[PDB]
Symmetry: C2
Subunit: 190 residues, 2 copies
């Protein structure tokens, strides 16, 4: 079996250089969702479980599949708390202290009223448990969530975790094996 990890197609907020929030897909975000469906089809899979977060950007991208999907709250993006929907310039200006502190310990730092990667890793324990005892699964999630899941399957330290390559519109096909996990990166250009 394989585990397909990718995140929702480009959102309005991604487009506007802002973090978090709960915005919908952009025009090409929607075009990614259709490209994702064609990719999943071209894989010749007979049974596939599709997981989504509760955020609209993931649900909408799953809608384009045509198949049923389950919504996990634990797959919701990291909460930047006070800094939700702000740009980095904005957070650097109004929260210079926080930003700097976040840069010194990215794995444990939480923005005021927010979550840390460490917290995210913790709430993702049951998602990983399930994944490990399932067959083909497609997880349409978020950059931070995807980084945590990928670190687990690729045995990465908590230091490497926050910097793991997790672009938009790229499907990571993971095939767990006896000890490691194979990885293949598919870029859906749209």
């Amino acid at each position: 079996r394989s585990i397909y990890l990718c995140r929702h197609g480009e959102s309005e907020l991604n487009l506007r250089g802002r973090i978090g929030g709960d915005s919908g897909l952009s025009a090409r975000g929607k075009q990614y969702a259709y490209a994702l469906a064609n990719f999943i089809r071209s894989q010749g899979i007979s049974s596939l479980k599709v997981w989504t977060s509760h955020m609209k950007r993931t649900i909408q991208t799953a809608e384009a599949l045509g198949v049923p999907y389950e919504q996990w709250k634990a797959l919701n993006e990291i909460d930047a708390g006070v800094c939700e929907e702000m740009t980095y310039e904005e957070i650097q200006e109004h929260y210079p202290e926080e930003f700097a502190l976040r840069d010194q310990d990215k794995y444990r730092y939480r923005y005021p009223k927010g979550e840390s990667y460490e917290d995210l890793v913790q709430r993702l324990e049951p998602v990983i448990m399930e994944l490990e005892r399932q067959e083909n699964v497609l997880v349409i999630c978020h950059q931070a969530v995807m980084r945590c899941l990928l670190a687990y399957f690729l045995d990465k330290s908590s230091d490497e975790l926050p910097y793991l390559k997790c672009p938009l519109h790229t499907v990571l096909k993971l095939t767990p094996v006896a000890y490691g996990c194979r990885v293949e990166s598919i870029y859906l250009n749209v």
Copy 2:
């Protein structure tokens, strides 16, 4: 003697989360240009020299001071090369390997056809020597440029350099003293 370092009021690209470019001051970016003129006047500085880069956002902010200023090409922001005007999501998507190599060594790293902080420090050398043989100077510049000037006066290393705190709308008043340099950060809220 005092050296005042600040960057142009918020640009149009700043508002969109895009790097580089040559956009102009945004509405509140102008409001900062004004508040800066108020701060500067109430500082009662004797024969204050005002340096600016060759870019719009910089000249535009100096324009609101009333007093004349000079432009140095050497003070132009770091060139992100092919990633110019891109959001971070965009560079992570279209240039995933490049984005990753950057986080590895931010001082020496160059985007495709862009400049590194090391390159920046080089072209700023003649700015530092002039700044040295001066009295009171207000240098209205850019984030990467400010980091390089600041690193010099505050005796910071090349590693700390790319991560030095340089918010928008904040003046950093440096006063070279015998043991080094005293610092005062003034946030101009607008």
